[PDB]
Design a protein around this ligand. Structure first.
Ligand SMILES: OC[C@H]1O[C@H](O[C@H]2[C@H](O)[C@@H](O)[C@@H](O[C@H]3[C@H](O)[C@@H](O)[C@@H](O[C@H]4[C@H](O)[C@@H](O)[C@@H](O[C@H]5[C@H](O)[C@@H](O)[C@@H](O[C@H]6[C@H](O)[C@@H](O)[C@H](O)O[C@@H]6CO)O[C@@H]5CO)O[C@@H]4CO)O[C@@H]3CO)O[C@@H]2CO)[C@H](O)[C@@H](O)[C@@H]1O
Ligand SMILES: OC[C@H]1O[C@H](O[C@H]2[C@H](O)[C@@H](O)[C@@H](O[C@H]3[C@H](O)[C@@H](O)[C@@H](O[C@H]4[C@H](O)[C@@H](O)[C@@H](O[C@H]5[C@H](O)[C@@H](O)[C@@H](O[C@H]6[C@H](O)[C@@H](O)[C@H](O)O[C@@H]6CO)O[C@@H]5CO)O[C@@H]4CO)O[C@@H]3CO)O[C@@H]2CO)[C@H](O)[C@@H](O)[C@@H]1O
Ligand SMILES: [Ca+2]
Ligand SMILES: [Ca+2]
Lengths: 585, 585
C-alpha cells in the first residue's frame, strides 16, 4: 500500500463528535489499497495494560483516487486516544497513529481527540433537515400593489428582458397573494434576497437596515407575510448583507460629509480623504470599484454591535433564519458570536452562509449551519447540463465534496441548480427539458436540502444576471404545468420518504460508458435507490441489490414493482429517465 | 507524478497570512516527485482576461515520504485565488487547484483564500521569540524561609528520594534569593508550576485561586519576586489550572455541604448526590478517580467569568504570561475569549498551552501563542537518549513536526527535554553526560524557545514523578559546574546570534551511517550551521557550504576557523561533539 496516500487528522471533518459520547472518524487511502480499516481506541488515561476497544470502519465512499473509511467510536469518558490498523489485499497490515506507520502498534502512536464538549457538538435546526427552500427575488416575483411601484416600471411579460437598472414592481403583497401557489408546490421555506431600504432593484447596497424598502411595502405588511406564510407551514429566511453597506447607509453618508471628522470613519476602509470623486473610489468596496457598496469593518466592535442589533430587530419580527451575503469576507470572530446571539434568541433559527467554494472553514459547528452549495451546482452543471463529465467523474466529485465537511453540515447544504447570479439551469441545459428534469430529480433525492429558484418550476429560462431576474410567469397558459406537477410529485415523495431527508447516502453504481449513475439513501430499515439514466438512449442495467435492503422494490414514480433476482435488479430506463426505488420499509 | 500523494488546503498550516497582504502557502508531494512548484494567483475578482501573478515555491523541507514546497503570495487586495503548477523530473506539467488535477489550468480550478482580516493574522509577543525559560517547581527549588515550611518537611539533600506526598520547604523567598544565580545562567523568564493555595506539594488541586499558598509566601512576597526578577531582565509566567479545581475550592466545598441545594452545582460535573466519599468519586475529575480534582465546567458562563477574574487579578500583579494546565480539555470558546481578554490587558503577555500531542487546533492564531512542545521532546529522546532513531529519521520527525503549525507558532514553541511529569533527561540518557550535552546543544540552537527544567543545568538526575522533583542541589561541590558553564555559553551564544532566535531552519545534512545531523539557521545575511556528531567515535565529514552562506565560517564554541574548499567544509568531530558555525554575518 501507498502510505503517502493515507490521511487522517484528529479534527475538522475527519474527526468530530455526533453526540457527547460518540466520535465519527474518517480515514483516506489510495483506492483499493486498503480492504479492512479498524480502529483500536481507549480513554486517554487508560492504563498501559488495559484492552483497547475495537471499531470497524466501513468504506463510506470512493472518488477517483481514494477510498474513504468511516467508523464510530463510543467514548463514554468523552476523551479518546486511537490508532488505525490497515489491512491490504495481500493481507499486509500496518498501524497508523499520530507518530506514524509501523507494524508494531506502540510505534505508530495514537491520535488523540482531547475532549468532547457538549457545546462543541455540531447541532442544527431539526426542521432544516427536511426543508424545501424557494428563493424569491422580490422585485420580480409578484406585483401585488402597483401603487408602490417605482417610477419607470416596465411591462410584466414573458418576453421581458431585464437591464441592470430595470424595475417591474415586485413587492411583499405580491408574495402574500401567491402563497397558495407556493403552498401547493410544497415549499416549506422562503429565502428572500434583500428587502430593506435600497435604491436598486437587487438592494444589496443597503440604505437602511431597519426599514422594509418602500417599493416592497412596510413593516406591517412584512409581519403579515410572516404570519400568512407560517400558518401555511412556510418559514422565512432573510438575506443579511453584513460584508458591506450601501453608499446611502447613514454611517457612510456621515463619513462622506464629515470625512476625517466623522465618528464613523473607522466603520469602513477609507484609503484617503475626501471620500471620493467618482467610480474611482478611494475606499474598499465589494468586488472591484463598486462605489455603491463600501465594505463594512465588521472587526470594529461598534460595527458588529450595530449589525447584531439589526439582526435582533428582524428576528423579533418572527423570521426563521439568515442567508449571509459574501459570508467569507466577514471575519470568523463575527460569525462565531453571531451564531451564539442568533441561537440564544431562537435555537431553531437557521444560518446559511453564501460562499461559492470549499466552505469547511465555516462549517465545523461554531459558525454556519449550512451554505449555498455551489460545489453541488458545478457538478450538476457538468453532469446534466454541459455533459463535461461522465457518471464516474460525477460520482467522484460528489463523494469528494461530501467528505469535505462533518455530516451535520452535509445533511443540510442548500443544493441549488442556479441563483440570481447565474444563468437559469434550463438555459445551461441548452433548453433541453429532459436533461433539466433529470437534474431536478437528482436535486430532490440527493443528500442535502433543495433550493428552488423562482420560475424554474414553471419553465422560465434566461442568461445570467440580469437576465436570470426576469418577471415571474403567472399566466397559466405560459407556464410549463407538466413540469410544475413533476416538481410537486418529487417534493411530496421527499416529505414522504424518511431516507430522502434524514438518510445517509452511498454510491450504488457509476458507469462512464453508459453514463448511468445511482446512489442509495438509507435510514433505519428504509432504503431508497435512485437510478439516473443520463443518456439520450434507452438502456437496461443489472444492479446488485443494495446492502441490506430487501428483495422487493417499488419505483415510487410509476408504481412499478421490481424484484431481486439472485441478488440483482434488472432495470430498463428510457432516455433521461430516473427511478426512485423504495424497499418498502 | 503520484497525484495521490499531493496535498494542500487553503487554511490551517498550509495557507495562512504572515501580514495583512501576504499569504504563505505550502504544498506537499511524494519526495522526489516534484522538481518545480509554482503558484499562479490573482485577486478573487480579477477578470478572466487579466494575467496571473507568479510565485516560485522553494522546497522548505523533506521528511521520510514527502517534499514540502512553500511560497509567499503578495496579495494587495487581501483576497486571493490560486492554482499550483507542478513540474516532474521529466518535465511533466500538471495544474493543481480546488477542482483537482489537470494538464489544463482552467480544469484544475483554483483554491481560494477568501479574505485576509488583520485581526486573524497570527501575532505573538516579540520578546517570546528570543527567550530562554527556566521552569521552577517551587516546593523543590529553594527554601528561603524555613518558618513557613509544611508539616513533616524532609531533609534537603542530594540523596533525597521524594514520595508522592513529600515536602522539602521550597518557597518564593528562596527563588528571590537565587535570582543572581538564575541571572548568571542567562535565563530570561521563569515558568512556575502552581503557586496558589493548595494542600499538596504540586498544588494542582487549587483551594484558593486568589491567594499565594502560605507555604510559598504571601502577595507582598510575590510582588517583590516579580519586581526583583523584572529588574534582572527576567519575566514571570504562571500556571493556570482552569480545567479542574481542588476539592477545597470554595465552590466545591459549597456543593459538598449543600448538594443539590448548592448554587454552584453546575460549576462541576456531578452525577448524583450526595457528593464524593472516598476514591469512589461520583463527579468528573481530572484523569480517572482523582477526588482532589473536580473538573470545572468552563462552558458555564459563571465559571468562565470567575476564572477570567482570577486571570485579571494576577495580571494586575505584573506577570508576563500563562502556562495552561491540561489546556486541551477546556473548550475552544473559553480559550478564544481568554486570549482577547489577556491581550487587551497586556498585548505582550504570553499564552502557552500544555498539550502533549498535535496542538494545531489551538495554534492557528486565535488561542495560544505556543505550547509545551512534547513532540520535540519525543524526537530528542529517541535520537539523543535511547538511540531508537538515526539522524535521518530525526531530521524527518523534526521537519514533519515543523510543517504541522504556522511559522508564528513554530518560532516560539517551548522546547523541553523533560518536565516535572517525566524522568529527568540525564536519566533518559542512562547517565551519559556526553549524550546529554549534545541534546542540550541541540535544544539551545534549534528553532523554538528552550525550556530548562530546574537542576538539569547542574547535573540532577531522577526517575519520573515524584523522583524528578528532587530538592535542588545548591552545594557547589555536589553541582556539575562544568555543565553549568556549558549551559551559560550556549545561552550567551543564542542571545548573540540573531539567527538562533529569529532565523528560520533548514536541513543541512543527515547521515544514518555516521549518525551525523546538521541544520542551518538563517536570518538576513547571517547563517549559522549546527553540526552534531551523535556517535561515540571521532569522525570527519564533508558538507556542502550552506546555501548562500559565504565561504568563511567560525565555530563559536572553540574559535576554530573553517574555510571550505570547492564549496565544501571538512569537519572532524570528536565523540558526541557539536559545532556552531557562524558565517560571520
Ligand atoms: O459589473 C459589475 C457587476 O454589477 C452587477 O452586479 C451586482 C448584482 O446584480 C447585485 O445583485 C449585487 O450582487 C450580489 C449578489 O446578488 C449576491 O448573491 C452576492 O454575490 C457575490 C458573491 O457573494 C461573491 O462571492 C462573488 O461570487 C464569485 C465567487 O466568490 C467566485 O468563487 C467565482 O465563482 C466561481 C467559483 O469560484 C467556482 O468554484 C465555480 O466552479 O464557478 C464559479 C463561477 O461560475 O466568481 C463569482 C463571481 O464573481 O460575486 C457575487 C456577485 O456577482 O453578493 C453580490 C454583492 O452584494 O451587487 C452586484 C454589484 O453591484 C451586475 O449584475 C453584474 O453582472 C456585474 O458583473
Ligand atoms: O495515582 C496518583 C497519581 O499521582 C501523581 O499525579 C499527580 C501529579 O503528581 C501532580 O503534579 C498533578 O499532575 C498535573 C501535572 O503536573 C500537570 O503538568 C498536568 O499533567 C497532565 C497532562 O496535562 C495530561 O495531558 C496528562 O498527560 C498525558 C498526555 O496527555 C498523553 O499524551 C500521554 O503522554 C505521552 C505523550 O503523548 C508522549 O509525547 C510521551 O512521549 O509519552 C507520554 C506518556 O504516555 O499520557 C500522559 C499521562 O496520562 O496527564 C498529566 C498528569 O500526569 O496536569 C496534572 C493534573 O493537574 O496531579 C496528578 C494527579 O493527582 C503521579 O504523578 C501519577 O503517576 C499517579 O498516578
Ligand atoms: Ca408594486
Ligand atoms: Ca520554606
Amino acid at each position: 500500500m501507498l502510505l503517502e496516500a493515507i490521511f487522517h487528522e484528529a479534527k475538522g471533518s475527519y474527526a468530530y463528535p455526533i453526540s457527547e459520547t460518540q466520535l465519527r472518524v474518517r480515514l483516506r487511502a489510495k483506492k483499493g489499497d486498503v480492504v479492512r480499516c479498524e480502529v483500536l481506541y481507549a480513554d486517554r488515561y487508560a492504563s498501559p495494560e488495559e484492552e483497547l476497544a475495537h471499531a470497524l470502519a466501513g468504506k463510506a465512499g470512493s472518488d477517483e483516487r481514494f477510498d474513504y473509511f468511516e467508523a464510530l467510536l463510543e467514548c463514554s469518558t468523552k476523551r479518546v486516544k486511537y490508532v488505525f490498523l490497515l489491512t491490504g489485499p495481500q493481507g499486509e497490515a500496518v498501524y497508523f497513529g499520530e507518530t506514524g506507520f509501523s507494524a508494531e502498534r506502540s510505534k505508530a502512536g495514537v491520535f488523540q481527540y482531547a475532549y468532547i464538549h457538549r457545546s462543541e457538538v455540531f447541532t442544527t435546526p431539526e426542521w432544516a433537515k427536511e426543508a424545501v427552500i424557494y428563493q424569491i427575488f422580490p422585485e420580480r416575483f409578484a406585483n401585488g400593489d402597483p401603487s408602490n411601484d417605482p417610477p419607470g416600471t416596465e411591462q410584466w411579460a414573458k418576453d421581458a428582458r431585464p437591464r441592470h437598472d430595470s424595475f417591474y414592481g415586485g413587492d411583499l403583497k405580491g408574495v402574500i397573494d401567491r402563497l397558495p401557489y407556493l403552498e401547493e408546490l410544497g415549499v416549506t421555506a422562503l429565502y428572500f434576497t434583500p428587502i430593506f431600504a435600497s435604491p436598486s432593484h437587487h438592494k444589496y447596497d443597503t440604505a437602511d437596515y431597519l426599514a422594509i424598502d418602500p417599493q416592497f411595502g412596510d413593516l406591517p405588511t412584512f409581519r403579515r407575510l410572516v404570519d400568512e406564510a407560517h400558518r401555511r407551514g412556510i418559514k422565512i429566511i432573510l438575506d443579511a448583507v453584513f460584508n458591506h453597506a450601501g453608499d446611502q447607509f447613514f454611517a457612510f453618508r456621515d463619513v462622506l460629509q464629515k470625512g476625517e471628522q466623522s465618528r464613523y470613519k473607522d466603520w469602513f476602509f477609507i484609503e484617503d480623504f475626501p471620500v471620493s470623486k467618482t467610480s474611482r473610489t478611494n475606499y474598499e468596496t465589494f468586488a472591484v470599484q463598486v462605489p455603491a457598496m463600501p465594505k463594512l469593518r465588521t472587526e470594529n466592535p461598534e460595527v458588529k454591535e450595530y449589525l447584531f442589533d439589526v439582526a435582533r430587530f428582524w428576528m423579533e419580527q418572527g423570521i426563521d433564519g439568515w442567508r449571509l451575503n459574501v459570508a467569507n469576507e466577514v471575519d470568523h470572530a463575527f460569525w462565531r458570536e453571531f451564531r451564539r446571539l442568533v441561537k440564544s434568541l431562537n435555537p431553531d433559527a437557521l444560518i446559511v452562509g453564501e460562499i461559492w467554494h470549499d466552505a469547511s472553514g465555516w462549517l465545523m459547528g461554531d459558525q454556519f449551519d449550512s451554505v449555498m452549495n455551489y460545489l453541488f451546482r458545478e457538478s450538476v452543471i457538468r453532469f446534466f447540463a454541459t455533459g463535461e463529465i461522465h457518471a464516474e467523474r460525477f460520482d467522484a466529485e460528489l463523494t469528494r465534496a461530501r467528505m469535505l465537511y462533518p455530516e451535520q453540515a452535509a445533511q443540510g447544504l442548500w443544493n441549488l441548480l442556479d441563483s440570481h447570479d447565474t444563468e437559469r439551469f434550463l438555459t445551461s441545459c441548452g433548453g433541453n427539458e429532459a436533461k433539466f428534469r433529470l437534474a431536478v430529480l437528482f436535486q430532490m433525492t440527493y443528500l442535502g436540502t433543495p433550493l428552488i429558484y423562482y420560475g424554474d418550476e414553471i419553465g422560465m429560462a434566461g442568461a445570467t444576471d440580469p437576465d436570470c431576474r426576469r418577471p415571474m410567469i403567472w399566466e397559466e397558459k405560459e407556464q410549463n404545468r407538466g413540469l410544475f406537477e413533476f416538481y410537486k410529485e418529487l417534493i411530496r415523495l421527499r416529505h414522504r420518504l424518511a431516507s430522502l431527508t434524514r438518510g445517509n447516502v452511498r454510491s450504488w453504481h457509476a458507469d462512464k460508458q453508459a453514463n448511468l449513475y445511482a446512489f442509495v439513501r438509507t435510514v433505519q430499515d428504509q432504503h431508497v435507490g435512485v437510478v439516473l439514466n443520463n443518456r439520450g438512449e434507452k438502456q437496461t442495467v443489472l444492479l446488485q441489490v443494495p446492502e441490506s435492503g430487501g428483495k422487493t422494490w417499488l419505483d415510487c414514480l410509476t408504481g412499478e414493482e421490481v424484484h431481486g433476482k439472485q441478488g440483482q435488479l434488472k432495470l430498463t430506463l428510457r432516455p433521461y429517465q430516473g427511478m426512485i426505488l423504495w424497499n418498502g420499509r
